[PDB]
Write a protein that binds this DNA or RNA. Structure first.
Ligand SMILES: Nc1ccn([C@H]2CC[C@@H](COP(=O)(O)OP(=O)(O)OP(=O)(O)O)O2)c(=O)n1
Ligand SMILES: [Mg+2]
Ligand SMILES: [Mn+2]
Length: 539
DNA sequence: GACCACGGCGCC
DNA sequence: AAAGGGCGCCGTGGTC
């Protein structure tokens, strides 16, 4: 290009280089911004941030978070990554976008800046006429990048000392199981090694191999596999317990405390805006969208996430979100009436499994019905359902036949979605967010049908993601007026942090904002709870 | 040290 | 395991 003197002109496309991928832990190595025929490089990166008024370019949110870390108000402007992601959800990284639309993602701030300008021109040029994508960009994604920036920079408080002592506790319980797995095995080995375990269970012990692995075709030792052999030998019962514990200790209990930022005393996740194929968000380093909740030990980990002194956590989750979305998208008179009568499909389905009244269904029994109702909905097999519920295959198939018979309009939408998908080559959400499926007309029955399940799942899951995103955009400005913070987003759940005084008012406000974000043919009811910790905030 | 494929699994 | 979908992270085992 051409060397220009810092600062750059108003609205120059910025390019930056970090020491590591986490903006909260990264050192701003280099900083530059591209203008028409100029490069505008910076001498000192941290001082150069003071000159900028807006971050426009590739990964705009990342630099914004780093600036927001240094107490700087540097909002996220245009981001070509957002443009490419809307053009195609496949475009997830700058490395994949640049080579597709003329350019090369490098490690130079100036060349990264230059790319951001030219990539903008191509992508914004290809976004002409796509008013459904433009509306989804200007009114949702582009504002959301600002909200996510404040969320990542804020972070969530974690009870360090609690998890520390909890680690030593789980440790002794792991050694007990491990010692109780060795004796039955007759010898010691690596329980973490599925290879060594496979030999012990199937070659040494007389246990039957029930499943194979995908890539290598080895005898599987998965949970579902061991679940079937839970009475074939007592060692299997203990392995499942060992699996659960080491899983929680190696993923959450141990890593999370060492992820606390020294200057904030909080946990800072990354909300990837262009990572999923359905339009969902993504949480990484650390993943705060997969904090355990199912098991008792998992709930103990959940309580480690607490509010700041004098503050309270406020959790809001859309009740039966995709089922309501499905009711709006399909227009099933029976399904719409279900919610209009204030029914709970998860509760009734759990009432059928355990053979108990709807009132006898506890919060843990109902949750187990989610994977079944959602499973069956998106093409689960009667075989798989039979084994999970420990019921005969004849009883499992009867559920599916009865499940889709309660609502004789959903399948009309499913085939409609697939047919429209085979014609256009892509399925779209309620707002217009499209996903290109290239195997709807595949010749292989496996490849074709697998692409089909991805095809009609995208509009329902994607719509829910769209509604949540739009809700966050409408809700966030209201938070700053009441001194409230937006902490986490869990697909259909929002975790807020408000002062103890107005914590009640925030919950009532946030609930109403989320319920009326986009009125459908079905009411979008939201369950809200206030607690001193995350687990308490959902009870 | 940085990276990779794989099985496995936590959540939504 | 399998005809549920969407993620990220873990240890193992391995390469460079
Ligand atoms: N095993 C699962 C669980 C969830 N989901 C999707 C469906 C909706 C979305 C979030 O829904 P949840 O909050 O997990 O459950 P729900 O349907 O919203 O019901 P509730 O809010 O009462 O738990 O994630 C899924 O596809 N598969
Ligand atoms: Mg939820
Ligand atoms: Mn929900």
């Amino acid at each position: 290009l051409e060397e220009a003197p810092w600062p750059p002109p108003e609205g120059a496309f910025v390019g930056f280089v970090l020491s590591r991928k986490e903006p909260m832990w990264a050192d701003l190595l280099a900083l530059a911004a591209a203008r028409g025929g100029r490069v505008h490089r910076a001498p000192e990166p941290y001082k150069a941030l003071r000159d900028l008024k807006e971050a426009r370019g590739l990964l705009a949110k990342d630099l914004s978070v780093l600036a927001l870390r240094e107490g700087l108000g540097l909002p996220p402007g245009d981001d070509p990554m957002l443009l490419a992601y809307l053009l195609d959800p496949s475009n997830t990284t700058p490395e994949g976008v640049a080579r597709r639309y003329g350019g090369e993602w490098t490690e130079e701030a100036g060349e990264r800046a230059a790319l951001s300008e030219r990539l903008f021109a191509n992508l914004w040029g290809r976004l002409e006429g796509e008013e459904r994508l433009l509306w989804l960009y200007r009114e949702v994604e582009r504002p959301l990048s600002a909200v996510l920036a404040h969320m990542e920079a804020t972070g969530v408080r974690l009870d360090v000392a609690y998890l520390r002592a909890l680690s030593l506790e789980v440790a002794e319980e792991i050694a007990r199981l491990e010692a109780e797995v060795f004796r039955l095995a007759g010898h010691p080995f690596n329980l973490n090694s599925r290879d060594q375990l496979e030999r012990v269970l199937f070659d040494e012990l007389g246990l039957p191999a029930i499943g194979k692995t995908e890539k290598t075709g080895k005898r599987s030792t998965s949970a579902a596999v061991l679940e079937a052999l839970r009475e074939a030998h007592p060692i299997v019962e203990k392995i499942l317990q060992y699996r659960e514990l080491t899983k929680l200790k190696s993923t959450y209990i141990d890593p999370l405390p060492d992820l606390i930022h020294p200057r904030t005393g909080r946990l800072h996740t990354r909300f990837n805006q262009t990572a999923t194929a359905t339009g969902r968000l993504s949480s990484s380093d650390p993943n705060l969208q997969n904090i355990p909740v199912r098991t008792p030990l998992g709930q103990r980990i959940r309580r480690a996430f607490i509010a700041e002194e004098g503050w309270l956590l406020v959790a809001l989750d859309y009740s039966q979100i995709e089922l309501r979305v499905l009711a709006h998208l399909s227009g099933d008179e029976n399904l719409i009436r279900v919610f209009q009568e204030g029914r709970d499909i998860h509760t009734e389905t759990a009432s059928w499994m355990f053979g108990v009244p709807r009132e006898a269904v506890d919060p843990l029994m109902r949750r187990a019905a989610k994977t079944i109702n959602f499973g069956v909905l998106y093409g689960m097999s009667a075989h798989r359902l039979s084994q999970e519920l420990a019921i005969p295959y004849e009883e499992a198939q009867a559920f599916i036949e009865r499940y889709f018979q309660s609502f004789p309009k959903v399948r009309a939408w499913i085939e409609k979605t697939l047919e429209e998908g085979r014609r256009r080559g892509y399925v779209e959400t309620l707002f217009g967010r499209r996903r290109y499926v290239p195997d709807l007309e595949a010749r292989v029955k496996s490849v074709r049908e697998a692409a089909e399940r991805m095809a009609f799942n995208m509009p329902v899951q994607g719509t829910a993601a769209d509604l949540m995103k739009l809700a966050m955009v409408k809700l966030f400005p209201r938070l700053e007026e009441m001194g409230a913070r937006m902490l986490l987003q869990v697909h259909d759940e929002l975790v807020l942090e408000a002062p103890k005084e107005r914590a009640e008012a925030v919950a009532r406000l946030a609930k109403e904002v989320m319920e009326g974000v986009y009125p459908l043919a079905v009411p979008l009811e939201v369950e809200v709870g206030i607690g001193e910790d995350w687990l308490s905030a959902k009870e």
